[PDB]
């Protein structure tokens, strides 16, 4: 109800839908609530959302519907997004960008272990609790790639052009695991760097030739150190099947590296 409820501030807006900072008319309670004007769609995010139980995963409390607008309730991340955390052109404290990393890393192990991709990993959908602690947020395009131990292949074009792996622009059909590690090198890349290193991974973009052709004397690479930027080398690799994996991303150098808060 417009009674239990007070819409304080927009909070942002997810791939389908907006997000309002909702004050509790009674407790005062602060969360965030999706607010969706119209439905398949949201029938299948709210089942993904209640499948969800990790640390690194955002809190789901429940939905209303009233008329052509469906509420979703989910715990407000006080710490705010990880893409208010990277300073423009520089990025943040590599020790704070690998904690995040690994906190990433848990999170999509752990979709991808109950057949679950996201499908639109960046800065924005990354929140932080009160402890910045990383949530993986905004379910809103996510679906299921593993049932019944069987694999599915993904067909369709979704995500955000700077994010997405270049297989996503050139086949059919492709597989769901490698398409989320790319990102997850794209949000690496960019809380070192603090600036994405191009507009889409396609060959008629220059930024994306000269990293196949291995210019790490140009933005953003020169800004990254070897030891991740070696990490780096593995994850944004064009051909998925030749891609590195998360077991081997846990295997990494820089990622097994001790860093000095
Ligand atoms: C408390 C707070 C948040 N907290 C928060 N908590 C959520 N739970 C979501 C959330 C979801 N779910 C979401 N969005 C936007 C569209 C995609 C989705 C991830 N956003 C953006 C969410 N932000 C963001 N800033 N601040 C502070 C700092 C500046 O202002 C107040
Ligand atoms: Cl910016
Ligand atoms: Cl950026």
């Not at 769901?176 to 290193?197: F, N």
Request: contains cysteine; negative net charge.
């Amino acid at each position: 109800f417009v009674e239990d409820w007070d819409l304080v501030q927009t909070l942002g807006e997810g791939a389908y839908g907006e997000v309002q900072l909702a004050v509790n008319r009674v407790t005062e309670e602060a969360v965030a609530v999706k607010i969706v004007d119209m439905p398949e769609n949201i029938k299948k995010e709210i089942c993904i959302l209640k499948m969800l139980n990790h640390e690194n995963v955002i809190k789901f409390y429940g939905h209303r519907r009233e008329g052509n607008i469906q509420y979703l309730f989910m715990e407000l991340a006080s710490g705010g997004s990880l893409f208010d955390r990277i300073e423009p052109d520089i990025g943040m404290p590599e020790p704070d960008a690998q904690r995040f990393f690994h906190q990433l890393m848990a999170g999509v192990v752990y979709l991808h272990g109950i057949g679950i991709t996201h499908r639109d990993i960046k800065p924005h959908n990354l929140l932080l609790d009160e402890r910045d602690n990383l949530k993986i947020a905004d379910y809103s395009l996510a679906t299921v790639f593993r049932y019944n131990n069987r694999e599915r292949l993904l067909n369709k074009m979704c995500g955000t052009l700077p994010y997405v792996a270049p297989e996503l622009l050139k086949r059919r059909e492709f597989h769901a695991e490698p398409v989320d590690v790319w990102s997850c090198g794209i949000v690496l890349t960019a809380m070192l760097a603090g600036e994405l290193p191009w507009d889409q991974p396609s060959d008629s973009c220059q930024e994306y030739s000269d990293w196949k052709e291995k210019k790490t004397y140009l933005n953003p690479w020169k800004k990254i150190d070897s030891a991740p930027l070696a990490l780096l080398h593995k994850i944004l690799v064009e051909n998925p099947s030749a891609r590195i994996t998360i077991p081997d991303i846990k295997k990494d150098r820089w990622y097994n590296k001790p860093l000095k808060k």
